[PDB]
Amino acid sequence: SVLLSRELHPVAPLLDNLISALNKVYQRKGVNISMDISPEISFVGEQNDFVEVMGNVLDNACKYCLEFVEISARQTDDHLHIFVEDDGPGIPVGLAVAREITEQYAGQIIASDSLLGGARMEVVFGRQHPTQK
Numbered sequence: 001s002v003l004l005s006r007e008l009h010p011v012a013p014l015l016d017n018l019i020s021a022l023n024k025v026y027q028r029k030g031v032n033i034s035m036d037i038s039p040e041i042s043f044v045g046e047q048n049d050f051v052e053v054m055g056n057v058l059d060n061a062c063k064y065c066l067e068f069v070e071i072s073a074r075q076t077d078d079h080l081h082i083f084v085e086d087d088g089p090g091i092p093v094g095l096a097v098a099r100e101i102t103e104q105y106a107g108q109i110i111a112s113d114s115l116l117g118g119a120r121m122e123v124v125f126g127r128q129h130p131t132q133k
């Protein structure tokens with residue numbers, strides 16, 4: 001009976017002012033943060049959930065890293081993929097919040113090994129079709 005558009009916010013922008021903030025919180029440590037995300041990649045749903053999840057994950061990344069954090073993302077159709085990898089010792093609680101919010105989006109958080117040297121956290125958000133009802 002009645003289709004609708006869902007709110008789509010670009011991700012690149014949403015993480016930029018979040019990176020800046022972390023930079024300040026950990027300049028003492030010396031953390032270098034890079035992101036490589038195209039301007040077309042976006043998120044569907046409550047922009048605040050995104051930033052709260054990605055704040056939790058990005059914060060945790062900066063803590064366990066040595067000095068490097070790499071951010072990148074890929075988009076499928078009903079799924080949004082965010083990759084956060086660090087060079088700190090790795091992964092062979094905390095993200096509970098990020099886990100709770102990604103749950104509502106039919107997604108999950110996955111840990112694995114990274115090339116840099118540490119954890120390669122992948123955040124997957126679901127329910128990303130851009131239409132509703």
Ligand SMILES: C[C@@H]1C[C@H]2O[C@@H]2/C=C\C=C\C(=O)Cc2c(Cl)c(O)cc(O)c2C(=O)O1
Binds near residue numbers: 065086089093118
């Ligand atoms: C507790 C939360 C996520 C937990 O479910 C995930 C599984 C394994 C975690 C293994 C670790 O060794 C700690 C860790 C490292 Cl080293 C890191 O670089 C980034 C992280 O985010 C975590 C972590 O522990 O994060």
